Amino acid sequence: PPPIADEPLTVNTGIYLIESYSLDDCAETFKVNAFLSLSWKDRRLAFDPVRSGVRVKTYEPEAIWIPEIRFVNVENARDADVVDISVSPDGTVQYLERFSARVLSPLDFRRYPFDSQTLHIYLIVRSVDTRNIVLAVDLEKVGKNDDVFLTGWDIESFTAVVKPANFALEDRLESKLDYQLRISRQYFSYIPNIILPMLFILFISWTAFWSTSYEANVTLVVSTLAAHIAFNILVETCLPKTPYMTYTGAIIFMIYLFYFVAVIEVTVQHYLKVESQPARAASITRASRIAFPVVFLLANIILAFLFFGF
Amino acid sequence: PPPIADEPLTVNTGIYLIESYSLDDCAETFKVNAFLSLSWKDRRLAFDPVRSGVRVKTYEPEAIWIPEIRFVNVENARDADVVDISVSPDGTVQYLERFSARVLSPLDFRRYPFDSQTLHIYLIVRSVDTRNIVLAVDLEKVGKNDDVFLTGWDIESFTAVVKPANFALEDRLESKLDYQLRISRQYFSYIPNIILPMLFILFISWTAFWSTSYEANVTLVVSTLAAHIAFNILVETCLPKTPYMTYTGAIIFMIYLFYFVAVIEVTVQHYLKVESQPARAASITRASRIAFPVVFLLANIILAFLFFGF
Amino acid sequence: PPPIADEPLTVNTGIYLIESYSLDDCAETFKVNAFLSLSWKDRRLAFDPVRSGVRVKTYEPEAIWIPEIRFVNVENARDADVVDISVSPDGTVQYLERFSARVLSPLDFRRYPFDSQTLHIYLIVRSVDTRNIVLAVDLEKVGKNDDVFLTGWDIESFTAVVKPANFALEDRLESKLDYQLRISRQYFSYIPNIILPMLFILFISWTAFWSTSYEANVTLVVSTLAAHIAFNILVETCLPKTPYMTYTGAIIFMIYLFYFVAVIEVTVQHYLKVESQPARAASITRASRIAFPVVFLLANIILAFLFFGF
Amino acid sequence: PPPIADEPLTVNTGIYLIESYSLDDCAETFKVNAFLSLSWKDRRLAFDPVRSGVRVKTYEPEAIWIPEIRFVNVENARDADVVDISVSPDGTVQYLERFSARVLSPLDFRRYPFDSQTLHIYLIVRSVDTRNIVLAVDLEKVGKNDDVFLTGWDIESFTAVVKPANFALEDRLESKLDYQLRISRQYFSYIPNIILPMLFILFISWTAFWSTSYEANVTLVVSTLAAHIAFNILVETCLPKTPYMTYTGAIIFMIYLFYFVAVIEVTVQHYLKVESQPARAASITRASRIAFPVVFLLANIILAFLFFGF
Amino acid sequence: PPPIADEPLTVNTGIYLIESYSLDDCAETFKVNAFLSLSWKDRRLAFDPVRSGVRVKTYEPEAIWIPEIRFVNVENARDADVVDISVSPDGTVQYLERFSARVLSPLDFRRYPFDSQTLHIYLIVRSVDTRNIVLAVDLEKVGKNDDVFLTGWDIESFTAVVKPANFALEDRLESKLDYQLRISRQYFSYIPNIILPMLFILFISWTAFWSTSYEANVTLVVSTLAAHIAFNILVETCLPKTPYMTYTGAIIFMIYLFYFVAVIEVTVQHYLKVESQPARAASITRASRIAFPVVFLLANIILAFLFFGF
Ligand code: NA
């Protein structure tokens, strides 16, 4: 029984983050726990305060026509507790619920793990005898609470795209709204735990350039190589399978290349020194001592530029 | 309370993908979030002047006879929210709910990870005093909304098989409808993370063909074998146990054969060269230097043709 | 209000498999999704169609006395949606529901992974003013559906055991029924992924019998040993801890023994060869080249017979 | 509306284990599926059979005052099926439900994996206006079904502590009952999968006592040590973090000590034998050949006695 | 419809811990099972005992107005079981429910695993026709049960912060209450499973200082480095990614540094000694023999002071 109107019905929306948590990169989901607040004109609910007795009268959801607001990018239907309903004299309805949902928003891993992300919560509503369009009351958005934390990330800002994408679907009109939680990853821990160990075992690997022991050099380069495969696996598992190339995915691959050519070099210099050609062998190795670090640093300049430098 | 039955009751169906997600290859399941739309006329509901109050009015599920539509290949009963019910002047009812389900559809892994799949959602309806058959209205199907993504996959098409399978079951006849979501896997990340590294360690394996140090050659070939075993494990765990052979299963197995014969050879050349036959030893190893890559490349040609080329 | 009869009430049962899936060997559980069909006579519900108006009438569960059937070997109570209730003129009630549950049935791992299993679904009912016995109607126990698949398994047959187990419980008598779905495992994928790799790494181990290189033979034997531990762990984790010995458990163990006496031999031939006794060492070694394959093939014949051969 | 009493109300309890399963050593939880039987006199319910149709009449839960009995050491409130309620003429009520709960009882891991455990189910009832005390009818306590099995454990006995702990809580008194399910771990599988391999690689380690090859002795001892760390990890993951010391925890730690002094010996004999001091070196090694197994066997007797022998 | 008020309604609170469990460090959550006790005056409930029959009357939650108390840092709405409601003649209501929830509270990992934590449970209530303030009755908060155990942790205390935080939210005010469960972790098992083995393989690593065998020293240092990579991984995974530096993270990283400088050194001493400079090389290792343990112990004093010494 929507409010009988001479005009299209605006439902005012606002979301107060109380808790957000469980950002799942493999799933590309996160879990949020918040207030949802709705506001609208139902003049059928208009009462005269003085004669009816009181400043606001309160119903239970069963009593009133309430718009069916739905989350678009949500997995299973939301859980909500209706915290309050209030009608002001002129028929102004104040709805307040507390919900929790895991919403599904895609992620961009190209600058992983130095990425920043923008999570979206989309509210849609579907019209009937009066049409519904939604819009945002920014004072009842108040952002998040000041204890709101998302483990492993920095919350940059929580705002809403002020007013909606209105479109046709299955013969009726729908109005969609976009609330946006921007986060930046805390990359710190990747450094002592992933990047630096990788670097170390790579450097250890080419330590085989001030050596002339084939019988040992093979041992070195393949040891370090194994450890790097372990790191590749460790990293790969806690990420989704992306159709594009990431920054540390790039680094990791580039490293496999350095290991392969290192192996090649090692092999060549040994073949040479058994072909009674120690001059040319030793000069290849001395080249490598300069080549490998320099071409590495260069490749990394190019690479970092290619990812972040645009 | 079935509808006055002058005819077999047609229920018009449609599914609108809002979200699909969590394709589980070990499970052969995926999760869908969609509009389900049902429509039929119940002439008992027919009132048809705009009289005495409204053009079309809305009842709630408990007031009306609703065909009980069920998904065949789902795990638990679906979780559904009824979005609206509208009854038309001759009692033409349009039912709209929003559900989420994890649907269970088999997958074909033979051309993994270059496989494509066609997921199924099967709807049955079951009869009584009149017979029910289902069918599809394509406006209320239109597939996905074009924001639908399934991580790690490209969504090709969402269609429905227009004609139902109407068949006998126990007491009464049932009507089944087949909606089909075709997807193709995004193989990109498999190359830098699995195939290329696999290849590299196989090649480093063959580097022992330009060496005569048994004591180190063994080190080489068993090391690389180890990393292959690790890769075999990594890949194999995250797939189900298929009764058939997959493409990268074929590849991985072939690679085992190459490692085993490599080892055999290494052993042979050291045994010969301690059995005082360095001519024949050096000729067998040098032979292998050409042999192994070529038998590898053509074996892969045979294999690729054997899989994709048919 | 149970049906007042003369003496003991037969409630006719039938189960139609719709989906079965998620066999968990560590849990020894699996998930089933099926029709449950019940039938019994309540002569109080008997109506004659001439005066009552219709050929058969249908109630809702609260309208009728319905026997409460329960599954014995189930984790949490199955949850079901009732498809229909029909009473025949003579008071014959035909009940039909659709349930899904994970039923808990034990497994025999002695011939893993070449095992076959017999899954059970047990139905219980509890009596009062009339005695209840359950029995099976085979015509609407039309078995299973032909799209029914259980991943990694072949479904051999689905039938039910015709006479119930009637016994005293909590001082009233209960009636129990046994439906049993026999499956046989699909071992195919175990061969290229576990067994053949196991064998290979074992043979590569025995390559140390054509080497006089301790310095390397040690490398060979502990390397392969390690890979065999990785395979052991891999196989072992996806199994429960059985109080008995499994077939591949036996194999894996025997393999450990082979690795140990191999190490021993290597140790011995090196000590002999430095103890200035190359004669007995080399003859011990040539012995081993013959012994190890032969005692392996023998032990495996013995074992294969010991398990499968009785 | 409790039965108005001239005395404290005894509610008679009994629990019938139908299924038990999912013992979690990390969580220290397990899952149970059982009958709960309650009984009390509500003299207000007293009816005499002479008046009405039947000797005992049956109600449904909403009609009657039913005591709220709760499991104390359970995670979330149990979910139950009320199977039957019968009031006998003297107003004697027999209540029967079938529940499933995962109950939380601590475990003692000191003799792992040769420990036995005592699982608990605690029932409380909280009085009001009259006193409620719980007590046990052993005739209605089953112990278990004759098919009740708990994977990886031997179920010894299910009994109950007959007199309750009745105590003050938040100003009213509660009555607690303690049911005790005794189990013994089935350790068989630990021997072929964990204990014996672990020992073997320890022995293989000690092969370096018959070697005099530093490069190979080192190869040996670090290889074996690697596998022992892998085993330590393997075991450690499936146990919780106890403030005390477990048995295989002790053994495993001891083994680490053996590997360390082993390495020390190896390094020492190499150093002596390069200090042109083969006398001292070879005599230390010959010593170790006897020393290591003996100090091991002793350490292990002292250990076992220290654990099980008290 | 709160009790008509002349002034702010105080709702008196209390929490009795029955079970707490599943402390998750990656999630930074834990699970609790407790009594929640609420008490307030609603004078509309005032009764004459004599005329009405009973000194205290008990309702069920629907009959009465009950204040909506909600938990702030919880994931989903708690699951609650309402155990009692008792009203006193003067309209004083005693509410008692048994709830279970996983509450989300942040953790400080800087002194891991020698950290202590203060877990929080925050209760809020929100106002309407009258305002609610919550407050704590310390007796109905009679601490914890002394069978309350938290695996892997020692429970220090359970208390409540006596004064509420009363603040404005969304145009009406809320009253927040802070209960604090202080725990300290049980570090015992970290010593035999992580710290000592790490130390052992680091020492085993430094045995390469009494060895001029490059060909083996590489073997030593990189094998131990490998196992230490495994320890880093093991430890790291069971912790969340903190933006800051932890204590054992600090240690593990320092250890990587020691490995790198070790490799550097063995590499240089070998390079020197094949570069025909045996005096100074041997003096570099003789130095290292003292240097590495002493700089290690010194760095550890500085680090431990840096963490715990504040
Ligand atoms: Na080596």
PDB file of C-alpha atoms in Angstrom, chain D residues 162-297:
ATOM      1  CA  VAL D 162      24.501 -39.936  40.343  1.00  0.00           C
ATOM      2  CA  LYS D 163      24.561 -37.205  42.943  1.00  0.00           C
ATOM      3  CA  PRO D 164      24.398 -33.624  41.575  1.00  0.00           C
ATOM      4  CA  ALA D 165      26.280 -30.461  42.371  1.00  0.00           C
ATOM      5  CA  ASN D 166      23.654 -28.136  43.734  1.00  0.00           C
ATOM      6  CA  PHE D 167      24.994 -24.666  44.315  1.00  0.00           C
ATOM      7  CA  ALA D 168      24.144 -20.983  44.361  1.00  0.00           C
ATOM      8  CA  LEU D 169      24.259 -18.932  41.198  1.00  0.00           C
ATOM      9  CA  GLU D 170      23.122 -15.339  40.803  1.00  0.00           C
ATOM     10  CA  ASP D 171      20.929 -15.679  43.893  1.00  0.00           C
ATOM     11  CA  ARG D 172      18.981 -18.812  42.873  1.00  0.00           C
ATOM     12  CA  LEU D 173      20.269 -22.431  43.155  1.00  0.00           C
ATOM     13  CA  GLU D 174      21.202 -24.690  40.257  1.00  0.00           C
ATOM     14  CA  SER D 175      21.443 -28.491  40.063  1.00  0.00           C
ATOM     15  CA  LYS D 176      24.199 -29.981  37.953  1.00  0.00           C
ATOM     16  CA  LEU D 177      24.578 -33.542  36.630  1.00  0.00           C
ATOM     17  CA  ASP D 178      27.776 -35.045  35.152  1.00  0.00           C
ATOM     18  CA  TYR D 179      27.652 -37.721  32.438  1.00  0.00           C
ATOM     19  CA  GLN D 180      30.986 -39.341  31.613  1.00  0.00           C
ATOM     20  CA  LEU D 181      31.936 -40.924  28.349  1.00  0.00           C
ATOM     21  CA  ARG D 182      35.323 -42.700  28.630  1.00  0.00           C
ATOM     22  CA  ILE D 183      37.365 -43.267  25.520  1.00  0.00           C
ATOM     23  CA  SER D 184      40.845 -44.542  24.663  1.00  0.00           C
ATOM     24  CA  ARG D 185      42.815 -43.313  21.712  1.00  0.00           C
ATOM     25  CA  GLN D 186      43.510 -45.907  19.044  1.00  0.00           C
ATOM     26  CA  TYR D 187      47.252 -45.446  18.628  1.00  0.00           C
ATOM     27  CA  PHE D 188      47.897 -48.240  16.059  1.00  0.00           C
ATOM     28  CA  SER D 189      48.249 -45.933  13.087  1.00  0.00           C
ATOM     29  CA  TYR D 190      50.807 -43.657  14.750  1.00  0.00           C
ATOM     30  CA  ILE D 191      53.306 -46.502  14.612  1.00  0.00           C
ATOM     31  CA  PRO D 192      53.489 -47.091  10.848  1.00  0.00           C
ATOM     32  CA  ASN D 193      52.793 -43.435   9.930  1.00  0.00           C
ATOM     33  CA  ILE D 194      54.735 -41.420  12.526  1.00  0.00           C
ATOM     34  CA  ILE D 195      56.810 -43.342  15.106  1.00  0.00           C
ATOM     35  CA  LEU D 196      58.654 -45.839  12.901  1.00  0.00           C
ATOM     36  CA  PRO D 197      59.567 -43.419  10.079  1.00  0.00           C
ATOM     37  CA  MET D 198      60.825 -40.959  12.676  1.00  0.00           C
ATOM     38  CA  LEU D 199      63.012 -43.653  14.272  1.00  0.00           C
ATOM     39  CA  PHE D 200      64.317 -44.829  10.882  1.00  0.00           C
ATOM     40  CA  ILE D 201      65.530 -41.400   9.878  1.00  0.00           C
ATOM     41  CA  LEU D 202      67.201 -41.180  13.323  1.00  0.00           C
ATOM     42  CA  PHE D 203      69.049 -44.439  12.606  1.00  0.00           C
ATOM     43  CA  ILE D 204      69.958 -43.372   9.090  1.00  0.00           C
ATOM     44  CA  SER D 205      71.361 -40.321  10.805  1.00  0.00           C
ATOM     45  CA  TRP D 206      73.652 -42.500  12.901  1.00  0.00           C
ATOM     46  CA  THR D 207      75.036 -44.143   9.768  1.00  0.00           C
ATOM     47  CA  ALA D 208      77.491 -41.199   9.782  1.00  0.00           C
ATOM     48  CA  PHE D 209      79.340 -43.034  12.526  1.00  0.00           C
ATOM     49  CA  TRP D 210      80.659 -45.596  10.008  1.00  0.00           C
ATOM     50  CA  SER D 211      81.695 -43.026   7.402  1.00  0.00           C
ATOM     51  CA  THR D 212      84.723 -40.620   7.821  1.00  0.00           C
ATOM     52  CA  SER D 213      83.344 -38.562   4.871  1.00  0.00           C
ATOM     53  CA  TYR D 214      82.646 -35.041   6.177  1.00  0.00           C
ATOM     54  CA  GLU D 215      80.848 -33.956   3.054  1.00  0.00           C
ATOM     55  CA  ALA D 216      78.673 -37.060   3.149  1.00  0.00           C
ATOM     56  CA  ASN D 217      78.261 -37.179   6.917  1.00  0.00           C
ATOM     57  CA  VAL D 218      76.902 -33.640   6.751  1.00  0.00           C
ATOM     58  CA  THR D 219      74.687 -34.586   3.776  1.00  0.00           C
ATOM     59  CA  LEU D 220      73.274 -37.436   5.952  1.00  0.00           C
ATOM     60  CA  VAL D 221      72.678 -35.610   9.213  1.00  0.00           C
ATOM     61  CA  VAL D 222      71.043 -32.472   7.701  1.00  0.00           C
ATOM     62  CA  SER D 223      68.827 -34.636   5.455  1.00  0.00           C
ATOM     63  CA  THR D 224      67.552 -36.705   8.281  1.00  0.00           C
ATOM     64  CA  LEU D 225      67.175 -33.602  10.482  1.00  0.00           C
ATOM     65  CA  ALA D 226      65.076 -31.950   7.773  1.00  0.00           C
ATOM     66  CA  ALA D 227      62.670 -34.920   7.734  1.00  0.00           C
ATOM     67  CA  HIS D 228      62.474 -34.842  11.518  1.00  0.00           C
ATOM     68  CA  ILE D 229      61.475 -31.173  11.468  1.00  0.00           C
ATOM     69  CA  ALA D 230      58.820 -32.102   8.921  1.00  0.00           C
ATOM     70  CA  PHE D 231      57.515 -34.757  11.284  1.00  0.00           C
ATOM     71  CA  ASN D 232      57.619 -32.381  14.298  1.00  0.00           C
ATOM     72  CA  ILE D 233      55.529 -29.924  12.250  1.00  0.00           C
ATOM     73  CA  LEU D 234      53.122 -32.647  11.112  1.00  0.00           C
ATOM     74  CA  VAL D 235      52.434 -33.824  14.654  1.00  0.00           C
ATOM     75  CA  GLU D 236      52.400 -30.333  16.211  1.00  0.00           C
ATOM     76  CA  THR D 237      49.718 -28.971  13.877  1.00  0.00           C
ATOM     77  CA  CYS D 238      47.071 -31.432  15.090  1.00  0.00           C
ATOM     78  CA  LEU D 239      47.436 -30.739  18.762  1.00  0.00           C
ATOM     79  CA  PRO D 240      46.612 -27.648  20.779  1.00  0.00           C
ATOM     80  CA  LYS D 241      49.233 -25.620  22.632  1.00  0.00           C
ATOM     81  CA  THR D 242      49.548 -27.212  26.041  1.00  0.00           C
ATOM     82  CA  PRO D 243      51.346 -25.457  28.987  1.00  0.00           C
ATOM     83  CA  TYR D 244      52.628 -28.889  29.899  1.00  0.00           C
ATOM     84  CA  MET D 245      54.774 -31.440  28.079  1.00  0.00           C
ATOM     85  CA  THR D 246      53.279 -34.332  26.083  1.00  0.00           C
ATOM     86  CA  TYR D 247      54.892 -37.727  25.508  1.00  0.00           C
ATOM     87  CA  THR D 248      55.710 -37.582  21.811  1.00  0.00           C
ATOM     88  CA  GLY D 249      56.511 -33.956  22.456  1.00  0.00           C
ATOM     89  CA  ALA D 250      59.196 -35.132  24.843  1.00  0.00           C
ATOM     90  CA  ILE D 251      60.409 -37.834  22.435  1.00  0.00           C
ATOM     91  CA  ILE D 252      60.532 -35.406  19.484  1.00  0.00           C
ATOM     92  CA  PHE D 253      62.439 -32.817  21.532  1.00  0.00           C
ATOM     93  CA  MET D 254      64.877 -35.440  22.714  1.00  0.00           C
ATOM     94  CA  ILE D 255      65.430 -36.401  19.087  1.00  0.00           C
ATOM     95  CA  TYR D 256      66.365 -32.790  18.331  1.00  0.00           C
ATOM     96  CA  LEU D 257      69.026 -33.057  21.042  1.00  0.00           C
ATOM     97  CA  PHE D 258      70.366 -36.239  19.477  1.00  0.00           C
ATOM     98  CA  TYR D 259      70.637 -34.551  16.064  1.00  0.00           C
ATOM     99  CA  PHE D 260      72.479 -31.581  17.539  1.00  0.00           C
ATOM    100  CA  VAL D 261      75.174 -33.495  19.415  1.00  0.00           C
ATOM    101  CA  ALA D 262      75.353 -35.807  16.399  1.00  0.00           C
ATOM    102  CA  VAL D 263      76.274 -32.824  14.205  1.00  0.00           C
ATOM    103  CA  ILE D 264      78.777 -31.762  16.939  1.00  0.00           C
ATOM    104  CA  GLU D 265      80.478 -35.188  16.826  1.00  0.00           C
ATOM    105  CA  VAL D 266      80.670 -35.128  13.016  1.00  0.00           C
ATOM    106  CA  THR D 267      82.198 -31.665  12.985  1.00  0.00           C
ATOM    107  CA  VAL D 268      84.607 -32.660  15.730  1.00  0.00           C
ATOM    108  CA  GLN D 269      85.924 -35.806  14.000  1.00  0.00           C
ATOM    109  CA  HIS D 270      86.408 -33.888  10.761  1.00  0.00           C
ATOM    110  CA  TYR D 271      88.327 -31.197  12.619  1.00  0.00           C
ATOM    111  CA  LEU D 272      90.491 -33.704  14.461  1.00  0.00           C
ATOM    112  CA  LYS D 273      91.141 -35.652  11.273  1.00  0.00           C
ATOM    113  CA  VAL D 274      92.340 -32.464   9.568  1.00  0.00           C
ATOM    114  CA  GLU D 275      94.466 -31.549  12.586  1.00  0.00           C
ATOM    115  CA  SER D 276      96.372 -34.715  11.665  1.00  0.00           C
ATOM    116  CA  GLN D 277      94.948 -36.263  14.772  1.00  0.00           C
ATOM    117  CA  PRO D 278      93.170 -39.410  13.462  1.00  0.00           C
ATOM    118  CA  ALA D 279      93.678 -41.210  16.764  1.00  0.00           C
ATOM    119  CA  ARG D 280      91.303 -39.008  18.742  1.00  0.00           C
ATOM    120  CA  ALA D 281      88.903 -38.607  15.853  1.00  0.00           C
ATOM    121  CA  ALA D 282      88.416 -42.254  15.064  1.00  0.00           C
ATOM    122  CA  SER D 283      88.211 -43.128  18.748  1.00  0.00           C
ATOM    123  CA  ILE D 284      85.442 -40.549  19.348  1.00  0.00           C
ATOM    124  CA  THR D 285      83.546 -41.982  16.404  1.00  0.00           C
ATOM    125  CA  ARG D 286      83.940 -45.595  17.521  1.00  0.00           C
ATOM    126  CA  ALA D 287      82.668 -44.391  20.907  1.00  0.00           C
ATOM    127  CA  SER D 288      79.617 -42.727  19.333  1.00  0.00           C
ATOM    128  CA  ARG D 289      78.649 -45.944  17.545  1.00  0.00           C
ATOM    129  CA  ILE D 290      77.946 -47.475  20.982  1.00  0.00           C
ATOM    130  CA  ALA D 291      77.113 -44.303  22.865  1.00  0.00           C
ATOM    131  CA  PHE D 292      74.323 -42.923  20.712  1.00  0.00           C
ATOM    132  CA  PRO D 293      71.981 -45.930  20.668  1.00  0.00           C
ATOM    133  CA  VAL D 294      72.607 -46.691  24.343  1.00  0.00           C
ATOM    134  CA  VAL D 295      72.079 -43.148  25.639  1.00  0.00           C
ATOM    135  CA  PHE D 296      68.989 -43.157  23.394  1.00  0.00           C
ATOM    136  CA  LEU D 297      67.518 -46.387  24.739  1.00  0.00           C
TER     137      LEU D 297
END
